[PDB]
């Protein structure tokens, strides 16, 4: 019995710049109970048969969860660009797995704002697929010395989402889960029903 629900029905989600990954091995993943909810507005799979989702064996299955704005879910897909894809969470061009998202304004929003959720705004190079950057180092823009302190062309790499119930759906919070499947040369730890 595979405990997929705990990551979906989790109390608190992570920030996108520092997403949370959980390995899901030695379990039988019945994905039919995952399609139950109509709550997952954006459910897209990449590289898997439409019906063999529940009838397949995978060596490893990882989960990656975080919170972003509704208009940035389009960036949770292979071959995407933007602040989320280049700087926070990048799927590979050859990604194999599904992506689930759902509106959580009713939970991840506070009267006045819930600024605990952050996103990386600056970065020198783009993020490699499944590479996580949690460097809270001052970003140097051009040739201005920062001395570890903000200033001209010296800005804190992180920034905060301002989630409020009054915001538009494009700026409301959405909870994303990126089930990524792995087929390796080893007995499959994850097999479906």
């Amino acid at each position, epitope marked *: 019995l595979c405990p997929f629900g705990e990551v979906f029905n989790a109390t608190r989600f992570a920030s996108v710049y520092a997403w949370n990954r959980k390995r899901i091995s030695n379990c039988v993943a019945d994905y039919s109970v995952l399609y139950n909810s109509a709550s997952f507005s954006t459910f897209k799979c990449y590289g898997v048969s439409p019906t063999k989702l529940n009838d397949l064996c995978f060596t490893n299955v990882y989960a990656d969860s975080f919170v972003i704005r509704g208009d940035e879910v389009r960036q949770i897909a292979p071959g995407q660009t933007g602040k989320i894809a280049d700087y926070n969470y990048k799927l590979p061009d050859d990604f194999t797995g599904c992506v689930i998202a759902w509106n959580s304004n009713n939970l991840d929003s506070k009267v006045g704002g819930n600024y605990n959720y952050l996103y990386r705004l600056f970065r020198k190079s783009n*993020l490699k697929p*499944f590479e996580r950057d949690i460097s809270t180092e001052i970003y140097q823009a051009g040739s201005t010395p920062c001395n570890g302190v903000e200033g001209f062309n010296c800005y*804190f790499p992180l920034q*905060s989402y301002g989630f409020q119930p009054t915001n538009g759906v494009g700026y409301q919070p959405y909870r994303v889960v990126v089930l990524s499947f792995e087929l390796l040369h080893a007995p499959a730890t994850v097999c479906g029903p």
Partner: antibody
Amino acid sequence: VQLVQSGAEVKKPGSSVKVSCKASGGTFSSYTISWVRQAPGQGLECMGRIIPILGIANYAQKFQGRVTITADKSTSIAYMEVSSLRSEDTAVYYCATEVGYSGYGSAEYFNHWGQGTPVTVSS
Amino acid sequence: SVLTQPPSVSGAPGQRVTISCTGSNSNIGAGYDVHWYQQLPGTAPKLLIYANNNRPSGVPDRFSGSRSGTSASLVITGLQADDEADYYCQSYDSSLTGSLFGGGTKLTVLG
């Protein structure tokens, strides 16, 4: 050692206490500030974090309303407070600087630790 | 979940010493790295190894780290009496949505 905390503190059950942290080997620059607790003869437990530059506080679930952490970037000092003290919360409380990196399995590590301030709760 | 450590390990001067840090899929099971700290009695912990295979300038050459799956190992090759201390490992847990320490191990140099 690496960051300077306040002095020792002895408090009665039900009191609240506030401790302070200042910087050695740095200037609080872009460093997240963590609070870790070491009970008597017991392992370490991280209860809180403060982002000085953004002023955003994240606390562990075992943290309740009771612990509240703040920090001033101007002053260069960081602080934490506990209310409704009891026998349980007797420990050396540490303030430490978190460090992040870019990588595939990135996880924060604490490079600088304070002196430790032992808070004892007794009647 | 949590990280598990030997409550105690004993070593003879000059021997190799292996301290373990095992975790479930919530922490070390995913890519999450492990970090080691040396803490002498009464002193504040000090960073010993970050990223497992890296040690800051000032950590002597005999400390190393290795990983293989859901476990992590701190090794002291040329054990010396200056190594009598507590050792904790630290990583991130997804269920906790935060950093996590281990139980610690007291290394008694039997010389």
